[PDB]
Symmetry: D3
C-alpha cells in the first residue's frame, strides 16, 4: 500500500520546512513501514549545512524516521485528533554511518517493537543505494 | 561511468539555492549528451505556493532544470564560464508537459546537443519519471 | 477593469513564492488581459539567480504570463472549483529578448487565440519600458 | 541622468536579501538628494506574515528603505564604507504613514540631506506611490 | 498575566516572518504591557543584515513594540474582527541607543498615553540586560 | 567570564542560516565544559511547519544545538577546523526529551567532554529552560 504526498499531508501535521517523508512505498499496520525521503540540493537547510559542502544533517534522518513511525502509528491505531500531538520521547543508539547528500533517495524502514512503560518503541534503518546510512531506536507516545 | 555529484555541479554552474535544479549527473559524453537527476522533494520552497494542499512540480522548472543540464554539458565540453559571464537561455521550442511531476519523483533528464545555428546552440531535452516521459522541449542557449 | 492582489488571490490558487502576477491593469473577457509583475531584488529566487548578478529567470516570465492567462480564463469562463487545476500543457516559440532585472516593471499582455484539440491557446508578450522582453504561445486546459 | 542599477547598489550597501529594499536609483546629486525606487511585489517574503489574506507593505520597511537610500547618497557623496564599518541608523523623527502600500505599487522615495548636527546626519524622506505621499520621516544616521 | 505564543497568535494577525512578539510577561489593561522578543541568529533577516555581522534592524524593534501595543489594545478594548486591521499611523522620537544582537532577549514595555485626534498614543521602551536599547512614541488606530 | 558572541561563533563553526543553532557562549573551560544559549523565537523558519497553530521546537534540533556546542568546545580546546574539514556527528546515546521547548524559551545548554574512546569523542549534554531539564543526551563526534 503506497501513500503519496496528499495522503501523507492528511496523516501528519508537519508542514514545510519540516515534513521529511516524501512517499510511503509499503506498510503493514502494526508491523512496518517503508518510506522515501528524496534528498535534493533545493532544500532550505542545505544553505547552512554546509556552505560549499551540502550534507544532509544526521538529526533530520532521525526526524524523518520518526515521522515515518507517526504515519505507521496513525494508519495502524487511528489518526490524531486536531490539536493532539504524537510525542517524540527519546532515542537510543542513533548511529550515523555515512553522509547523505543531494541526489540520494533515502529509503527508511521503521518497525514497531512493543509498547513498554507508556511509550511505543520502534527501530528505524535508513539506506541509500542499499547501504545503511543510519539506525536508531525511537520512542514515541500520543 | 562519468558522474558528477553536487560539489562538481556547484563548481560548473553559477546557480545557487533556490534555483539550482540539478542534483546529480549520472553520465555524459562531451559534445553529445548528458543525463542528470532532479530529486523532487516536498521540502522545496516553491511547493508552499504551487499549490497549497496539492504539490505539483511546476512545468517551468522542468524546463529550467533541463536548461541547467545543457549548461553543465556545454561547460564540460567547451570550457567553463569565466567569472561574470553567463550562459544565456535564448528560447524554447515545443515544450510539452505530459503528466504532473510530484514529491517523491526522481526526474531523470537527458539532454542532447543538436547543432549550432545562427549564433545559438540547440539542444533537445526529455525528462522521465519511472521510465515515462513527463516533458520534452528544444532549448536554445549561447555564451 | 483593474484587479488588485486580493482579487488575484481569489482567482488563482498560486501562493508565495510562486504567485507572479501583482496587478491586472485591464482585461476584456475572452479577448485579452494586461498584468504587471513588479521585479524586486527582495524576491527569494534572486539569491540563487545569480549571486552578484540578479537576473529574473526567463522561465518565470513564462510562468507569470501563464498565470495571467489563468486569470483571464477564470474571469471569462468561470472560477476553478476547489481541487481543480488549470493545466499548463505546453509552450511554442518562447523567445527571451533581453534580461529582466530588479527595478523592472514587467507588463504582460496575453490574448486568447482559440480552442483547438482540447487545449486553449494564448499568446503572451512581456515588455519593460515599452520594449519586448519575451514572447510565447501557451497552451492551457481545465 | 545619474541612475544606479542593482549591481551598483550591491556595491555601495552592505544589505543583502531579505533586507535590501532599494531596487534602483533614478537620480541623485551629491550632498543634496537621491530619488530611488522600491518595487513592491507579492513575491517578497514578509507578505506571508503581513498579513495572511491581506498583503500590506509594513510601514517600518518604508522607513528602512528610505534610510537605505540615505546610505547610498552618503556613500556616493562622502565615501564608501570600509569593510566591517556600518552606517548607523540613530533615530527617527515624525514618521507619518499616510496610506497603505501594496503589491504592484512602485514606491518612489526622495531623500534630502538637511545638515550635520551634534554628531548626526539628518535627512528628510518622502515616499510616493502614483504621485501621492505615502510616508514621510526625518532620519538621523552616522558613520 | 503572561501570554504564550498560542495566545499571541490568537490576538495578532501577524504571522511568520513578521510576528515579533514571542511572549507577554505581564500586562494591565488600559495601562501597560511587558513583552519579550528573543533575538536569535536563526531568524531570516539576519542573512541580509548584515553578512558577517548580524545586527537586529532598529525598524524591527519599532515593529515589535507596535505589535505589543496591539496586543494591549486587543486585550483592553476588544479583539479585531476578521479583515479589520490595527493601523500603525506614526512614530515620534524613535531613538536607537545601542545594537541589539543574536542571544539578546529584548524586553519591551509599552504604555498607553491617551487617545487624541482619532489616534491612540503609546510609549515604548526596549531593554536588553536592563539597559535601554530603543525608545519611541507610537500612534495606532482601529 | 569566557563568553563568545555570534561573530566569534561564526568564526569557529561552519554552520550558517538556517542551521546555526548556538546564539551565544556563556562560559567554557577547555577540555572540560561549555555552556551555551539557544534563543527560541517564533521568527525561526522551522516553526511554520512544526506545527501550524502550535509551535514546538523540534527535539532533533535540541540534539543539533548541543552537538554544535560540542563543536565549539572541541575547536577552542583542540584547534580550529581547517577549510573543508568537518567535525562529524557519529552517534547519539540516550536522547531523552522531557518537556516541550517553545517560543520565548531561552534554552541553556551545558556540554561536558567525557573521553576519547575507540576513535570517537564522547560528550554529555543537558539542556535547560528556566532551570528545568528539557533534554539530555550523550553525543559522539570525531574530526
Amino acid at each position: 500500500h503506497t501513500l503519496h504526498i496528499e495522503e501523507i499531508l492528511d496523516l501528519l501535521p508537519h508542514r514545510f520546512p519540516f515534513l521529511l517523508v516524501d512517499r510511503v512505498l509499503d506498510f503493514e499496520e502494526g508491523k512496518f513501514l517503508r518510506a522515501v525521503k528524496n534528498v535534493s540540493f533545493n532544500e532550505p537547510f542545505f544553505q547552512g549545512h554546509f556552505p560549499g559542502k551540502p550534507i544532509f544533517p544526521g538529526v533530520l534522518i532521525l526526524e524523518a524516521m520518526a515521522q515515518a513511525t507517526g504515519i505507521l502509528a496513525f494508519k495502524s491505531r487511528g489518526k490524531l485528533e486536531p490539536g493532539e500531538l504524537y510525542y517524540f520521547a527519546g532515542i537510543d543508539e542513533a548511529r550515523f554511518k555515512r553522509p547523505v547528500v543531494p541526489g540520494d533517495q533515502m529509503i527508511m524502514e521503521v518497525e514497531f517493537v512493543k509498547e513498554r512503560r507508556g511509550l511505543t518503541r520502534f527501530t528505524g534503518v535508513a539506506k541509500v543505494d542499499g547501504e545503511i546510512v543510519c539506525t536508531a531506536t525511537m520512542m514515541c507516545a500520543r
